[PDB]
Write a protein that binds this ligand. Structure first.
Ligand SMILES: Cc1cccn2c(=O)c3cc(C(=O)NCc4cccnc4)c(N)nc3nc12
Ligand SMILES: Cc1cccn2c(=O)c3cc(C(=O)NCc4cccnc4)c(N)nc3nc12
Ligand SMILES: Cc1cccn2c(=O)c3cc(C(=O)NCc4cccnc4)c(N)nc3nc12
Lengths: 495, 495
């Protein structure tokens, strides 16, 4: 089956209200930039962002011109003429609306509280989807806390129920309405809901892992924001998952969550595969179409893993626009993020940037030796490794933020489509390198193992292996007379 | 209030059936050896052992002569003439009956399994108590496994209900009927039920910790069977409590259960006090009135921490009686166990034994240089440090196995009674030494702390400390926007 290619289309309310396809100073990325060829290379477009209002219903920004919004959506749905598989999802949430201190966070928490709130919220999602012509619902709550997770589960299940209903009602079995979420791509936020991944993912068609922003100016050491594999020379991080409410023993937590660890794309994926009931076909790897830039960096390792002087405040404090060649930074008033489109133009614009390659992380980076700058980003080369990863691990596909940040020819999107689908591409010899893999073992990736059946009344020594009720168990100490499962003395090590 | 002093009177069935007080070759320790003085030094005698029959009721061994049994028990209860505080408990279980592999083990499993089985078993206990004139019920199931624990507790609760009713029905307000159990004194067995210690001890007057047999010939290195504190030079053990069914986080398991650790009496006591709802005044420290002997030991440290050639299976599987001077070893066909009485005569008898002292563990040991022998045991000296520990830790008192192993003068009993109740004994400057204490910190022994109150809406840095809902909390990583108790980021550290 065809791998998912899920690209966000983000447009702020002011750009909707003043939508034009002929003035890049008003709308930098009009829907017209999404050509038929590009429409054939996507499977989903995540239109974004809608919100949840104080009435606890799915809603557009109250400032939205409803006619201008419908017109933007129509331009997106017209693209389905070029691709019968294409879906225009819409996204509820995002960081600004839905983080703990965001403007609407309480409406997310309160919408999922009761069966009545959940039914009201869920019905509003389907009503919105139908009123505007969307093909599915994407929820980007960043992120439900432990006590909110069950309500969030039930809210998803309720949307699932109404979406399947609407599919039968509209006779859409050939392209059924879908439900997805944006999931945390790093252990710290993932720890909030990790223990309930199985029930979170069960009503989803996909969970799109936000496997980017794994580095940034808020950390004191420069790093790759989306390393596939780990680099022993790079910084390592506390494995927050070892503190999630899993109820596991010490040996179980220790062998699932080595700490410190390399905060990589592969870590986030394996961490999802470690839980029982999380199918790899539903995991979608996120990739960034932008880079993050640091100032004040020391040479030696090309700016990698170096101290830096980049502010972490939002918004950017000063007017020091120090990313040389980033005209787009001036428009947006921030030198710390630059679209791939813009970084490509910096590389070919003779500005003093050197493109380097880390063969552990399998990602590019820019070092500005004169100005002491470092940029972590992704490109068509790094997408080669991530695509082969997606194929090797049988993931559902790829997600990226966002369409507007690709270059004018859509090379990043075309690359992703190519690596999955082109007869003229062959990655069978692509060498995935020797970067650090995430080797945690959990209930969802226990190996098949073979051991004598458990004999009741036997006294087992330490390390003995025994087969019992569908698992292979190992003793942690000696003189074991208890049965496996029933006792602190046995470790489940295989199936 | 008086510390408990709980002595086991153990008499096998055949000594009952042939009971006499005029032939130490039939009955080595008849009840007449408990003089009025020694009765005054006891607060409880645990008559042992009764069982649970296949009808899932408390019962004597079927082979018991019931007339002879009533006479032995009447002799023990007559002792109450000399001590109105004295209680003749009876004990259900013991290792032989109730261990995983013991002859009656399934009866213990089945007795507690259902409401009707527990009601029937609890009634049988109170009927046995009243019919024979006992003052309370002590249950030595060694040991219930995790899945069995809730049923065990309900049964203990059910016994508590009947016993409290029976107290009122019998006018025994001044000496209420009591309920105790013998609990594990070592982490391995303790890990079976550790997580439910609170509800296990709640219906009990006392939990009698079997803080002995912590060394023995089943272990590859000779060691002290009842070290008060640890010796860095001694062996260390896997801390099985970190695998108990606690549901705590990795950090919580780690700071509570250092591993490996020194298997000591202090470890067991602190391990009980680490759990919430386990009051120190219900914790009783077991001590041994016998010693454990090893052969094939090497010099260099008086036989301590040496490899050895002692068989570990039971029964002793040879007729080689190598504990020289040990008369009763021959009588009992086992050179691996000697009563304190026998050990003292060996020390008096010129047999080549040197009495040595470990000032870290605060326990004596014998070294036999000629024959390569090592004996771990306890005496009136080690009992000073332990009695002072009992007072300083505000424990309930002391328990011991068993009365028939004291010397004919009752020196061990008298020593215990002296250290608790003699007006002219002063241990205020008894040096408790620099042996290793158990450092684990858990929910029932958190340090009192202060910290600024948690303020919702605040974003906390890593390592920040706040007070909230009665506790002081620390963030384990940075950018924390959630409240303590609602997030994996907050670690309970205090108050
Ligand atoms: C201050 C801060 C602290 C911790 C995490 N933070 C974020 O994780 C974050 C994320 C975004 C963001 O927009 N990521 C792109 C995206 C794509 C699709 C769906 N949802 C989000 C943002 N602007 N600020 C963010 N600040 C923070
Ligand atoms: C083979 C073995 C391995 C590990 C520990 N082992 C014991 O810890 C133990 C303990 C006893 C025992 O009887 N202790 C006396 C007692 C006092 C009060 C209440 N209940 C029992 C026994 N006979 N064999 C025992 N074998 C073992
Ligand atoms: C994913 C992401 C996207 C955009 C901005 N982002 C942040 O601005 C950020 C900031 C922090 C952070 O730690 N900021 C200050 C601080 C340091 C130490 C203790 N307390 C607060 C963090 N951990 N993740 C962060 N992720 C993001």
């Amino acid at each position: 089956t065809r791998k998912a290619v899920i690209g966000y289309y983000f447009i702020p309310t002011n750009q909707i209200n003043n939508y034009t396809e002929t003035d890049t100073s008003v709308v930098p990325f009009p829907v017209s930039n999404i050509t038929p060829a590009k429409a054939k290379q996507l499977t989903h477009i995540n239109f974004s962002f809608l919100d949840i209002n104080s009435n606890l219903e799915c809603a557009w920004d109250p400032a939205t011109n409803d006619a201008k919004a419908r017109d933007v959506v129509n331009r997106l749905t017209a693209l389905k003429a070029h691709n019968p598989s294409l879906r225009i999802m819409f996204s509820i949430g995002g960081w600004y609306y839905s983080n703990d201190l965001g403007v609407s966070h309480a409406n997310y928490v309160n919408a999922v509280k009761t069966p009545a709130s959940r039914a009201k919220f869920a019905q509003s999602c389907v009503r919105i989807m139908k009123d505007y012509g969307f093909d599915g619902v994407d929820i980007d709550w960043e992120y439900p806390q432990a006590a909110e997770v069950d309500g969030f589960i039930a809210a998803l299940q309720e949307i699932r129920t109404l979406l399947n209903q609407q599919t039968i009602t509209d006779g859409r079995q050939a392209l059924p309405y879908q439900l997805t979420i944006a999931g945390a791509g790093g252990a710290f936020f993932l720890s909030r809901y990790y223990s309930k991944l199985a029930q979170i993912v069960a009503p989803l068609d996909y969970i799109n892992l936000m496997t980017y922003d794994l580095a940034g100016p808020w950390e004191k050491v420069t790093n790759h924001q989306a390393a596939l594999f780990g680099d022993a020379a790079g910084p390592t991080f506390y494995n927050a998952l070892r503190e999630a409410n899993l109820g596991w023993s010490w040996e179980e937590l220790t062998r699932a969550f080595p700490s410190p660890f390399s905060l990589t794309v592969d870590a986030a994926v394996q961490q999802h595969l470690m839980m029982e009931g999380v199918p790899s076909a539903k995991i979608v790897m996120g990739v960034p179409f932008y880079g993050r830039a640091f100032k004040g960096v020391s040479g030696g390792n090309g700016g990698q893993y170096s101290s830096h002087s980049t502010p972490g405040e939002d918004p950017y404090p000063s007017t020091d626009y120090w990313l040389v060649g980033c005209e787009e930074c001036v428009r947006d008033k921030d030198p710390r993020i630059a679209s791939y489109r813009q970084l490509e133009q910096m590389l070919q614009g003779n500005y003093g940037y050197q493109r380097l390659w880390n063969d552990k992380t399998k990602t590019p980076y820019l070092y500005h030796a004169q100005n002491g700058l470092f940029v972590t980003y992704d490109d068509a080369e790094s997408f080669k490794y991530k695509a082969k990863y997606i194929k090797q691990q049988q993931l559902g596909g790829v997600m990226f933020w966002h369409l507007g940040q690709d270059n004018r020819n859509g090379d990043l999107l075309a690359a992703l489509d190519r690596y999955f689908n082109a007869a003229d591409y062959d990655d069978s010899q692509l060498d995935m390198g020797t970067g650090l893999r995430y080797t945690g073992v959990g209930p969802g990736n226990l190996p098949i193992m073979t051991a004598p059946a458990y004999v009741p009344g036997t006294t087992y020594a330490q390390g003995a292996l025994v087969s019992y009720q569908g698992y292979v168990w190992q003793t942690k100490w000696g003189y074991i007379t208890s049965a496996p499962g029933s006792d602190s003395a046995w470790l489940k090590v295989g199936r």
